[PDB]
DNA sequence: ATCACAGGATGTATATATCTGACACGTGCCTGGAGACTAGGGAGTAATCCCCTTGGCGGTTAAAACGCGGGGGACAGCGCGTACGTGCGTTTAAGCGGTGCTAGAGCTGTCTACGACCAATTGAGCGGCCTCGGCACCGGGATTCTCCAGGAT
């Protein structure tokens, strides 16, 4: 059993992207998302939400 | 000097006849709509808890309302001159039609890596709690604005 470790670590993310996962897959936005499509939009909102607060 | 009218010139709308290709209708599929069936999760209902909206009171205070005087902008009127509009003649390449090539859209069939799904475990994040520190406010002083008088242009 491995131990549970946030995908954020993962990827270098301060941002949420388990969260992420699970907001796209429901909001209706499609039938299915794909591994990398959280993981890609979490870097993105982190991104932007880094350049206003700078 | 201005009004209106009549004539000409021009451009528009009108009826007419003919042409053609874009619609209206019919045929033959064929696959999506409709009927029939079970299974189970979402929506509906009521209980009821208590949070937050409503209403009311009294002070106290800044904010609105009102009135007056006077400067400054909005507006109308005038005249200059030039930057557009209109019409003519020459130049351009747009549009039409047809030809020929093949690049890439669109569909088929196969196979497999990917994600929905489900059950178990747990630690990342949310609610409630205390603590005190950055921000808002007070009062005083510094200095940085605007505006008028008097002396230049």
Redesign the pocket.
């Known amino acids: 059993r491995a131990?549970?470790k946030?995908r954020?670590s993962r990827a270098g993310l301060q941002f949420?992207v388990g969260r992420v996962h699970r907001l796209l897959?429901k909001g209706n936005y499609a039938?299915?998302?794909?591994?990398?499509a959280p993981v890609y939009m979490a870097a993105v909102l982190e991104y932007l939400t880094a350049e206003i607060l700078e």
């Open positions: 131990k549970a946030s954020s949420p897959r039938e299915r998302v794909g591994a990398g």
